[PDB]
RNA sequence: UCCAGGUCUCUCGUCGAA
RNA sequence: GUUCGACGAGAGA
RNA sequence: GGAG
């Protein structure tokens, strides 16, 4: 992806937006209890912790575009993945507007607690001023879509979240692109049936993990990926994507049954326009993270990409024995024979992708069931029931979370939620976690679940 | 004086009235 | 208890 | 800009 052009929003008849410049995050009562290396991301150019230019840092992800055509490897990649998806019977018929907006099996309602994007954000207008799940009213919505139309600019915000202090110093904060309510609705009408079929079918046929519950899904993964493991990381995947990959996505969408007018919606993802503060800018390429379908489309593209690389690097690879599960850029895969991920990274480079060793490792060495991760979780077979597998989030990540709060009123919910992640590390580790929580006054006021109760509910869930 | 911060998935919690 | 609904939070991508 |  590449920022092609920047103009003042005033030139283009857009207002200055007003982007929150202060974190909601503050140290919690457990800040001194646990060790941690993360702090709230830099949100503004005048952050005292900055050791580099902030705006340069945040837009640096747009590394550029490769100018190459859809080659024979891509075509074969698209054909093979389209053949899997054909078994799922995805309807290309538009989703009913009420279902698209207020929810249906496999697809939750629009989030009414989030911004409505442009122009509503500059008009003081919220989603709740327009939509209500209690009434399921569409009258005010139809009228706002008629009035303001589609293909509105997305609004760039700096994401408020914890980051390593290294990334704080370099100002390497992440950006989100707020989709207009109108475009979210139009997207959901057009692709809603695809969305729900993916959500309902996580696994190696969609090549997607969206819709999964790691507590249950982790036990299925080794059954689905029974070959030699393949995993690697991407650097700035979303923003690294060149237009050729969107061209591929549109082709696979056509093979699914979508027409040109419908695939043209992808042009608004690939060739996108944005508001940041007092600027209006144009990006060619890059998946604008925050558009409707971000996860599904990033995952679909990841399925096209990794097939492409396999086919290019290894002639006589048999994709029918390839298995992969992607969640956006995150991926875990297998092939019956050892695949050199460093060679895939090499081919990836020519396609404008930056692929590095899994989990920020030093070399593209062997990926094993013991060291592989997915959705930041390790895999550990239950010692009692070896066919059941624990999703294991590292305690250090659980520690970073508990050390901060967006509101001390939520302490009970926050800490309970973390317990449900922590116990998969085992009873000893869990009790040490509970103990440190109980080492400060507030901790002793919390209702925390017993290890035995968690294990019991888990086994019961199967 | 106060508000402004995406798409989605999963899970937990508080409310439900069948 | 169980479903389905509305609201809050946490985590992941 | 929205609201009180
Ligand atoms: Mg990964």
Residue numbers in the entry: 1 to 462
Provide text from the study:
Using this r2 RNA, we were able to obtain crystals of the CV polymerase EC under two conditions but in the same crystal form, resulting in a 2.4 Å resolution structure (CV_r2) and a 2.2 Å resolution structure (CV_r2_Mg) that clearly showed a Mg2+ ion pre-bound to the coxsackievirus polymerase EC in the absence of an added NTP. In the CV_r2_Mg structure we observe clear density for a six-fold coordinated magnesium ion bound to the polymerase at a site about 5 Å away from the active site itself. This is at a site that is commonly occupied by divalent metals in a number of other structures of the polymerase alone, and in several of the EC structures presented here the site is occupied by what is either a magnesium ion or a water molecule. In the CV_r2_Mg structure we see clear density for a bound magnesium ion that is coordinated by Asp330 in motif C and five water molecules in a six-fold coordination geometry, with Asp233 from motif A being involved in the network. This magnesium ion likely represents the polymerase bound Metal A ion that is moved into the active site to facilitate catalysis in conjunction with the Metal B magnesium that is brought in with the NTP, and it is bound in site where metals have been observed in several other viral polymerase structures even in the absence of RNA and NTPs.
